[PDB]
Ligand binder design. Structure first.
Ligand SMILES: Nc1ncnc2c1ncn2[C@@H]1O[C@H](COP(=O)(O)OP(=O)(O)O)[C@@H](O)[C@H]1O
Ligand SMILES: [Mg+2]
Length: 306
């Protein structure tokens, strides 16, 4: 199978170091806690390495008509945005995916490709489109179609070049820029890839998700709670325990309902758990989440339509 995979990414130091990594084990220093993952990336490993090992195979699967979802999960300042968006000197998984897709579809001259992108924010259970004007930004509504959840009136932009796809991301990014909001917000970058022979059509949704900071993941109000992250935890816990169907409260948050198909459903899902080794409690919560997520079972197939 290998439909679900989890890795951890330790950020380098910018205070006791509470965590160290020995191969693919993250262990508490002079402590009892340890967690095995399929891959742990150390402070000196690059977003290029993370992209190539974790994301590249999902981009390959997307071009073959599999749904694919990549999440960055972890504490504020742990590396989520560094990993998923990055900068000119060190591109994130999202810009790398876009370059990668446009370079890789050229290896299929037998096939016609149509690509379009959407970019949305979820903040305090409100969905906003990041690609329309600031004027046109309003709370959007999750609806179902003839079969599948969608975000009603979410801009979809056709893109023929990486340059135009990256111009849409830049636009959305200055709109995300528009107090401590981006650390409490989820962002979903989506590419819908359609292809056919140059005639059934392969349709895949590639979702690349930068989550709200897990400090607010999790029974009183000593401090703050993000509903989407709490429900994400709950949904993944229920799936990993072997439950299915109406037991699974996808509808309790915008995030879990939008990405319901990424959590036990039709796609290939990867979680990149980002951690700062100078954090104890927030790192521990993130590694428990990540560890639970390893045992989530997805059933992905090629999406070919009439
Ligand atoms: N792997 C890394 N290597 C170098 N700098 C990093 C790395 N991960 C994070 N940083 C830096 O640490 C800071 C916090 O990272 P950021 O991705 O903004 O965190 P988050 O989005 O999870 O809140 C930023 O200045 C970022 O560039
Ligand atoms: Mg961030």
């Amino acid at each position: 199978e290998g439909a679900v995979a989890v890795c951890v990414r330790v950020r380098p130091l910018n205070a006791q170091v509470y965590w160290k990594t020995d191969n693919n084990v993250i262990y508490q220093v002079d402590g009892s806690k340890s967690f095995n993952f399929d891959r742990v990336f150390h402070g000196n490993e690059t977003t290029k390495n993370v992209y190539e090992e974790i994301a590249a195979p999902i981009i390959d699967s997307a071009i073959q008509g599999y749904n694919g979802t990549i999440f960055a999960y972890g504490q504020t300042a742990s590396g989520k945005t560094y990993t998923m968006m990055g900068s000119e000197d060190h591109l994130g998984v999202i810009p790398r995916a876009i370059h990668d897709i446009f370079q890789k579809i050229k290896k299929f001259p037998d096939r016609e490709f149509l690509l379009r992108v959407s970019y949305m924010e979820i903040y305090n259970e409100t969905i906003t489109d990041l690609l329309c004007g600031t004027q046109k930004m309003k709370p959007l509504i999750i609806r179902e179609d003839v079969n599948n959840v969608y975000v009603a009136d979410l801009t979809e932009e056709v893109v023929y070049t990486s340059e135009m796809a990256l111009k849409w991301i830049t636009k959305g990014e200055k709109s995300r820029h528009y107090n401590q909001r981006s650390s409490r917000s989820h962002t979903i970058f989506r590419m819908i890839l359609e292809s056919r022979e140059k005639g059934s059509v392969k349709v895949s949704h590639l979702n690349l998700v930068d989550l709200a900071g897990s400090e607010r993941a999790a029974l009183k109000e000593g401090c703050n709670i993000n509903r989407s992250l709490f429900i994400l935890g709950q949904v993944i816990k229920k799936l990993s325990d072997g439950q299915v169907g109406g037991f699974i409260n996808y509808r309790d948050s915008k995030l879990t309902r939008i990405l319901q198909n990424s959590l036990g459903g039709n796609p290939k899902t990867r979680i990149i758990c980002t951690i700062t080794p100078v954090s104890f409690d927030e790192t521990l919560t993130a590694l428990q989440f990540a560890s639970t997520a390893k045992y989530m079972k997805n059933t992905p197939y090629v999406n070919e339509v009439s």
